[PDB]
Amino acid sequence: SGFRKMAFPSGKVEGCMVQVTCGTTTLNGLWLDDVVYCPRHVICTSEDMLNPNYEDLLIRKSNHNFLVQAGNVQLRVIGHSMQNCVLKLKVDTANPKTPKYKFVRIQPGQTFSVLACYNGSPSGVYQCAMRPNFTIKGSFLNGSAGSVGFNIDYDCVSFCYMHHMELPTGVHAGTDLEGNFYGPFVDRQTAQAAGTDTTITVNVLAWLYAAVINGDRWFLNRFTTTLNDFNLVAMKYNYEPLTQDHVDILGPLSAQTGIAVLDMCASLKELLQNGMNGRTILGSALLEDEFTPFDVVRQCSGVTF
Protein backbone atom coordinates (compact mmCIF):
# COMPACT_ATOMS: atom_id res chain seq x y z
CA SER A 1 0.00 0.00 0.00
CA GLY A 2 0.87 3.67 -0.23
CA PHE A 3 1.17 5.98 -3.22
CA ARG A 4 4.16 8.18 -3.90
CA LYS A 5 5.47 10.43 -6.65
CA MET A 6 7.91 7.83 -7.84
CA ALA A 7 10.71 8.24 -10.36
CA PHE A 8 12.52 5.58 -12.34
CA PRO A 9 15.86 4.36 -11.00
CA SER A 10 18.42 6.69 -12.50
CA GLY A 11 21.62 4.63 -12.70
CA LYS A 12 21.37 4.03 -16.44
CA VAL A 13 21.14 7.76 -17.05
CA GLU A 14 23.80 8.73 -14.52
CA GLY A 15 26.31 6.77 -16.57
CA CYS A 16 25.60 9.03 -19.58
CA MET A 17 25.96 12.47 -17.97
CA VAL A 18 28.99 14.62 -18.88
CA GLN A 19 30.05 18.25 -18.54
CA VAL A 20 30.38 20.49 -21.58
CA THR A 21 32.21 23.80 -21.41
CA CYS A 22 32.62 26.39 -24.15
CA GLY A 23 34.35 29.55 -22.99
CA THR A 24 33.03 30.41 -19.54
CA THR A 25 29.67 28.67 -20.19
CA THR A 26 29.27 25.20 -18.67
CA LEU A 27 26.29 22.85 -18.80
CA ASN A 28 25.47 19.14 -19.01
CA GLY A 29 25.58 16.81 -21.98
CA LEU A 30 24.28 13.31 -22.69
CA TRP A 31 26.94 10.84 -23.90
CA LEU A 32 25.52 7.94 -25.95
CA ASP A 33 27.90 5.81 -28.06
CA ASP A 34 30.39 8.34 -29.54
CA VAL A 35 28.14 11.43 -29.50
CA VAL A 36 27.52 14.04 -26.80
CA TYR A 37 24.19 15.87 -27.00
CA CYS A 38 23.80 19.24 -25.32
CA PRO A 39 21.81 22.50 -25.56
CA ARG A 40 23.22 24.71 -28.26
CA HIS A 41 23.27 27.84 -26.04
CA VAL A 42 26.52 26.49 -24.49
CA ILE A 43 28.17 28.48 -27.32
CA CYS A 44 26.63 31.75 -26.16
CA THR A 45 28.35 34.40 -24.10
CA SER A 46 26.56 36.67 -21.62
CA GLU A 47 26.11 39.29 -24.35
CA ASP A 48 25.02 36.67 -26.91
CA MET A 49 21.73 35.53 -25.39
CA LEU A 50 19.17 38.26 -26.20
CA ASN A 51 19.04 37.33 -29.91
CA PRO A 52 21.84 34.93 -30.81
CA ASN A 53 22.31 33.83 -34.37
CA TYR A 54 23.31 30.29 -33.57
CA GLU A 55 24.46 29.46 -37.10
CA ASP A 56 26.90 32.40 -36.99
CA LEU A 57 27.98 31.58 -33.45
CA LEU A 58 28.68 27.93 -34.37
CA ILE A 59 30.65 28.69 -37.58
CA ARG A 60 33.05 30.64 -35.39
CA LYS A 61 33.82 27.60 -33.20
CA SER A 62 35.98 24.54 -33.83
CA ASN A 63 36.26 21.17 -32.05
CA HIS A 64 38.90 22.41 -29.61
CA ASN A 65 36.50 25.06 -28.23
CA PHE A 66 34.38 22.29 -26.61
CA LEU A 67 35.78 20.84 -23.41
CA VAL A 68 33.90 17.64 -22.49
CA GLN A 69 34.60 15.93 -19.18
CA ALA A 70 33.30 12.49 -18.23
CA GLY A 71 34.18 12.31 -14.54
CA ASN A 72 37.92 12.94 -14.41
CA VAL A 73 38.40 11.96 -18.09
CA GLN A 74 38.50 14.63 -20.79
CA LEU A 75 36.83 13.42 -23.99
CA ARG A 76 38.35 14.63 -27.25
CA VAL A 77 35.86 16.28 -29.60
CA ILE A 78 36.42 15.22 -33.21
CA GLY A 79 33.29 16.65 -34.84
CA HIS A 80 30.48 19.08 -34.12
CA SER A 81 27.14 19.95 -35.67
CA MET A 82 23.83 21.65 -34.91
CA GLN A 83 20.57 19.77 -34.91
CA ASN A 84 17.69 22.19 -34.26
CA CYS A 85 18.35 23.46 -30.71
CA VAL A 86 20.90 20.81 -29.65
CA LEU A 87 24.57 20.30 -30.53
CA LYS A 88 25.93 16.90 -31.50
CA LEU A 89 29.58 16.68 -30.45
CA LYS A 90 31.24 13.60 -31.91
CA VAL A 91 33.91 12.28 -29.51
CA ASP A 92 36.67 9.77 -30.11
CA THR A 93 35.48 7.12 -27.63
CA ALA A 94 32.12 5.44 -27.31
CA ASN A 95 30.48 5.51 -23.90
CA PRO A 96 30.92 1.97 -22.53
CA LYS A 97 27.92 2.60 -20.26
CA THR A 98 25.53 3.38 -23.13
CA PRO A 99 22.17 1.74 -22.31
CA LYS A 100 19.68 0.47 -24.85
CA TYR A 101 17.82 3.67 -25.67
CA LYS A 102 15.31 5.53 -27.83
CA PHE A 103 14.61 9.20 -28.56
CA VAL A 104 10.84 9.66 -28.18
CA ARG A 105 8.72 12.79 -28.09
CA ILE A 106 5.95 12.76 -25.49
CA GLN A 107 2.43 14.29 -25.40
CA PRO A 108 1.09 16.78 -22.87
CA GLY A 109 -0.31 14.82 -19.97
CA GLN A 110 2.47 12.20 -20.03
CA THR A 111 4.99 11.89 -17.20
CA PHE A 112 8.74 11.28 -16.97
CA SER A 113 11.64 11.23 -14.53
CA VAL A 114 14.17 14.08 -14.49
CA LEU A 115 17.80 13.57 -13.43
CA ALA A 116 18.81 17.10 -12.39
CA CYS A 117 22.54 17.67 -12.90
CA TYR A 118 25.20 20.34 -12.40
CA ASN A 119 28.71 20.29 -13.93
CA GLY A 120 27.99 16.84 -15.36
CA SER A 121 27.20 15.35 -11.93
CA PRO A 122 23.75 14.09 -10.85
CA SER A 123 22.11 16.11 -8.07
CA GLY A 124 18.69 14.47 -7.66
CA VAL A 125 15.80 12.71 -9.35
CA TYR A 126 12.11 13.60 -9.47
CA GLN A 127 8.94 12.99 -11.48
CA CYS A 128 7.42 15.59 -13.89
CA ALA A 129 4.46 15.88 -16.27
CA MET A 130 4.38 17.65 -19.64
CA ARG A 131 1.75 20.29 -18.97
CA PRO A 132 -1.02 20.94 -21.54
CA ASN A 133 0.78 24.27 -22.23
CA PHE A 134 4.05 22.37 -22.95
CA THR A 135 5.91 23.64 -19.87
CA ILE A 136 7.12 21.47 -17.02
CA LYS A 137 7.05 22.42 -13.35
CA GLY A 138 10.62 21.37 -12.61
CA SER A 139 13.29 22.23 -10.07
CA PHE A 140 16.20 23.72 -11.99
CA LEU A 141 18.94 26.25 -11.27
CA ASN A 142 21.62 27.95 -13.32
CA GLY A 143 23.79 25.20 -14.82
CA SER A 144 21.06 22.54 -15.05
CA ALA A 145 20.56 22.83 -18.82
CA GLY A 146 21.29 19.54 -20.54
CA SER A 147 19.71 17.52 -17.72
CA VAL A 148 17.36 14.97 -19.36
CA GLY A 149 13.91 13.52 -18.74
CA PHE A 150 13.25 9.85 -19.45
CA ASN A 151 11.08 6.76 -19.00
CA ILE A 152 12.40 3.20 -18.69
CA ASP A 153 10.71 0.11 -20.14
CA TYR A 154 12.47 -3.15 -19.32
CA ASP A 155 16.11 -2.33 -20.09
CA CYS A 156 15.45 0.51 -22.57
CA VAL A 157 15.73 4.18 -21.63
CA SER A 158 13.36 6.35 -23.68
CA PHE A 159 14.76 9.89 -23.50
CA CYS A 160 12.03 12.49 -24.00
CA TYR A 161 13.26 15.83 -22.62
CA MET A 162 16.41 17.93 -22.51
CA HIS A 163 16.31 21.00 -20.27
CA HIS A 164 17.12 24.44 -21.69
CA MET A 165 15.53 27.34 -19.83
CA GLU A 166 13.30 28.91 -17.20
CA LEU A 167 10.31 31.09 -18.02
CA PRO A 168 9.50 34.18 -15.89
CA THR A 169 6.72 32.34 -13.99
CA GLY A 170 9.35 29.90 -12.70
CA VAL A 171 8.29 26.99 -14.95
CA HIS A 172 10.65 25.27 -17.39
CA ALA A 173 10.96 24.69 -21.13
CA GLY A 174 13.07 22.33 -23.16
CA THR A 175 13.32 20.15 -26.23
CA ASP A 176 13.05 16.56 -27.27
CA LEU A 177 16.39 14.89 -27.94
CA GLU A 178 16.22 15.89 -31.61
CA GLY A 179 16.44 19.51 -30.44
CA ASN A 180 12.83 20.48 -31.14
CA PHE A 181 11.18 22.59 -28.43
CA TYR A 182 8.07 21.49 -26.61
CA GLY A 183 5.66 24.35 -27.15
CA PRO A 184 6.05 27.85 -28.60
CA PHE A 185 9.36 28.69 -26.93
CA VAL A 186 12.80 29.69 -28.25
CA ASP A 187 16.26 29.51 -26.69
CA ARG A 188 16.70 33.26 -26.24
CA GLN A 189 16.46 35.45 -23.17
CA THR A 190 13.40 37.43 -24.25
CA ALA A 191 9.92 38.00 -22.90
CA GLN A 192 8.14 34.70 -23.44
CA ALA A 193 5.11 33.39 -21.62
CA ALA A 194 3.41 30.03 -21.40
CA GLY A 195 -0.11 29.72 -22.75
CA THR A 196 -2.84 29.25 -20.18
CA ASP A 197 -2.65 25.83 -18.57
CA THR A 198 -5.42 23.33 -17.81
CA THR A 199 -5.81 20.29 -15.55
CA ILE A 200 -5.16 16.82 -17.03
CA THR A 201 -8.54 15.14 -16.42
CA VAL A 202 -7.69 11.54 -17.25
CA ASN A 203 -4.81 11.74 -14.80
CA VAL A 204 -6.99 13.08 -11.99
CA LEU A 205 -9.30 10.10 -12.58
CA ALA A 206 -6.34 7.72 -12.53
CA TRP A 207 -5.20 9.15 -9.16
CA LEU A 208 -8.74 8.80 -7.78
CA TYR A 209 -8.55 5.12 -8.74
CA ALA A 210 -5.19 4.89 -6.95
CA ALA A 211 -6.86 6.41 -3.87
CA VAL A 212 -9.60 3.75 -3.93
CA ILE A 213 -7.01 0.98 -4.40
CA ASN A 214 -5.31 2.38 -1.27
CA GLY A 215 -8.52 2.54 0.78
CA ASP A 216 -9.47 6.22 0.42
CA ARG A 217 -13.17 5.94 -0.48
CA TRP A 218 -14.91 8.91 1.15
CA PHE A 219 -15.40 10.78 -2.15
CA LEU A 220 -17.30 7.91 -3.80
CA ASN A 221 -21.05 8.15 -4.38
CA ARG A 222 -23.93 6.22 -5.96
CA PHE A 223 -24.37 8.76 -8.80
CA THR A 224 -23.32 8.29 -12.38
CA THR A 225 -23.02 10.85 -15.13
CA THR A 226 -22.89 11.03 -18.88
CA LEU A 227 -19.65 11.80 -20.71
CA ASN A 228 -21.32 14.91 -22.18
CA ASP A 229 -22.63 16.18 -18.85
CA PHE A 230 -19.23 15.54 -17.30
CA ASN A 231 -17.38 17.44 -20.04
CA LEU A 232 -19.63 20.46 -19.45
CA VAL A 233 -18.41 20.51 -15.85
CA ALA A 234 -14.79 20.03 -16.93
CA MET A 235 -14.99 23.04 -19.25
CA LYS A 236 -16.26 25.25 -16.42
CA TYR A 237 -13.38 24.21 -14.14
CA ASN A 238 -10.59 24.47 -16.72
CA TYR A 239 -10.19 20.69 -17.05
CA GLU A 240 -9.31 18.99 -20.31
CA PRO A 241 -12.24 17.26 -22.06
CA LEU A 242 -12.51 13.56 -21.38
CA THR A 243 -12.62 11.33 -24.42
CA GLN A 244 -13.91 7.84 -25.01
CA ASP A 245 -10.25 6.86 -25.47
CA HIS A 246 -9.59 8.12 -21.93
CA VAL A 247 -12.56 6.09 -20.64
CA ASP A 248 -11.08 3.04 -22.41
CA ILE A 249 -7.56 3.61 -21.05
CA LEU A 250 -9.03 3.71 -17.54
CA GLY A 251 -10.74 0.35 -18.19
CA PRO A 252 -8.23 -1.77 -16.24
CA LEU A 253 -8.40 0.41 -13.14
CA SER A 254 -12.19 0.50 -13.49
CA ALA A 255 -12.34 -3.29 -13.55
CA GLN A 256 -9.91 -3.73 -10.68
CA THR A 257 -11.94 -1.45 -8.40
CA GLY A 258 -15.43 -2.20 -9.71
CA ILE A 259 -16.16 1.54 -10.09
CA ALA A 260 -17.28 2.49 -13.59
CA VAL A 261 -15.40 5.39 -15.18
CA LEU A 262 -18.54 7.51 -15.50
CA ASP A 263 -19.32 6.68 -11.86
CA MET A 264 -15.92 8.06 -10.90
CA CYS A 265 -16.60 11.10 -13.11
CA ALA A 266 -19.62 11.72 -10.87
CA SER A 267 -17.24 11.82 -7.89
CA LEU A 268 -14.92 14.26 -9.65
CA LYS A 269 -17.89 16.51 -10.52
CA GLU A 270 -18.84 16.68 -6.83
CA LEU A 271 -15.25 17.34 -5.74
CA LEU A 272 -15.00 20.16 -8.26
CA GLN A 273 -18.30 21.72 -7.19
CA ASN A 274 -17.92 21.38 -3.37
CA GLY A 275 -14.22 20.85 -2.59
CA MET A 276 -13.10 18.27 -0.05
CA ASN A 277 -14.66 19.80 3.12
CA GLY A 278 -11.35 19.63 4.97
CA ARG A 279 -10.52 16.06 3.97
CA THR A 280 -7.57 14.73 1.96
CA ILE A 281 -7.02 12.11 -0.76
CA LEU A 282 -3.73 10.17 -0.72
CA GLY A 283 -2.23 12.84 1.51
CA SER A 284 -3.26 15.77 -0.73
CA ALA A 285 -5.80 18.55 -0.28
CA LEU A 286 -5.75 19.22 -4.04
CA LEU A 287 -6.79 17.14 -7.02
CA GLU A 288 -3.52 15.63 -8.32
CA ASP A 289 -2.98 15.42 -12.08
CA GLU A 290 0.64 14.32 -12.66
CA PHE A 291 -0.02 10.53 -12.43
CA THR A 292 -0.98 8.77 -15.65
CA PRO A 293 -3.11 5.60 -15.69
CA PHE A 294 0.14 3.76 -16.51
CA ASP A 295 1.86 5.32 -13.48
CA VAL A 296 -0.97 4.11 -11.24
CA VAL A 297 -0.92 0.53 -12.54
CA ARG A 298 2.91 0.48 -12.51
CA GLN A 299 3.12 1.54 -8.86
CA CYS A 300 0.09 -0.36 -7.52
CA SER A 301 1.39 -3.57 -9.29
CA GLY A 302 5.17 -3.38 -8.73
CA VAL A 303 6.69 -3.35 -12.23
CA THR A 304 10.52 -3.45 -12.16
CA PHE A 305 13.47 -2.81 -14.48
Partner: peptide
Protein backbone atom coordinates in the same frame (compact mmCIF):
# COMPACT_ATOMS: atom_id res chain seq x y z
CA UNK B 1 10.71 39.79 -17.29
CA UNK B 2 12.72 37.47 -19.52
CA UNK B 3 13.49 33.83 -19.88
CA UNK B 4 16.74 32.58 -18.40
CA UNK B 5 18.88 30.10 -20.31
CA UNK B 6 20.16 27.69 -17.65
CA UNK B 7 23.71 26.90 -18.71
CA UNK B 8 26.36 28.13 -16.19
Amino acid sequence: PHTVLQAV
